[PDB]
Symmetry: C2
Subunit: 154 residues, 2 copies
């Protein structure tokens, strides 16, 4: 079989796939205070809970993960960070009840920008003071990702 025939014949639907997502932890100093950007979920799982602005790749427009994360942020948040840097990738069978799951987390520290929800998948968005966040119930493992992102600040 040749390279070309293999690619013409290749079918990924022949194989079990995992969930693939991105997440962002955006930090700011606002009113002297360290704040993190959280959205309120209007989708299951963790419906009604606050967690990080994240989401699924849309091959219809996304060239890369960087585009995905920026687009999820503008959609759920209206916030566009000055840069975005990869923080860590968490991938296992327990973090997401929907199945085996991989999320690529990003982070930035930035100046305050007012936020507004711009897509139906969330019902609120707010910069929360960090201390309040650590004692909140947050979606999935978003408390860990935030904890990891805070260590990156230091």
């Amino acid at each position: 079989m040749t390279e070309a025939e293999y690619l013409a014949n290749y079918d990924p639907k022949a194989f079990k796939a995992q969930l693939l997502t991105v997440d962002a932890v955006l930090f700011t100093y606002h009113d002297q205070q360290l704040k993190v950007l959280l959205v309120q979920r209007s989708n299951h799982p963790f419906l009604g809970l606050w967690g990080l602005p994240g989401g699924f790749i849309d091959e219809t427009c996304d060239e890369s993960l960087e585009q995905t994360v920026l687009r999820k942020l503008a959609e759920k948040t209206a916030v566009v960070p000055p840069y975005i840097e990869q923080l860590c990738t968490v991938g296992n069978n327990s973090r997401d009840a929907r199945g085996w799951s991989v999320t690529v987390c990003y982070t930035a520290l930035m100046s305050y920008q007012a936020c507004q929800i711009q897509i139906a998948s969330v019902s609120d968005v707010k910069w929360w003071p960090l201390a309040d966040v650590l004692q909140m119930p947050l979606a999935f493992d978003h408390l860990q990702l935030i904890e990891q992102a805070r260590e990156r600040l230091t």
Copy 2:
């Protein structure tokens, strides 16, 4: 719908999935040379070319990405690195001709371990001096990953 119900009715084949893989850049210092562990591929694409040891998740035995990468290395390489670090994640529509693709690349500097092939997706394994690697075509964007890990050393 309740959360328990949402989870029970969840079906991923409602949605397009992306390719998800791991890769590892293992370095050693041996015979006064930085070397990187490569494998000679026996699957398309880039059949017959050298590349990193990597591959697809097996939900059957892998609880985590770390477990996936460790297994791929055992199968293709017989090497069991004494530790492993996440290097970065690359996800885009160009790097793998099979489709939109995310790889999670790991790395480690370790003392030498003899390597042998233990799975048929590979036909040779070798610890390559780094200057020789510059002289070969490597599979996908693997050279980029190697160079990234190599620069991280300093």
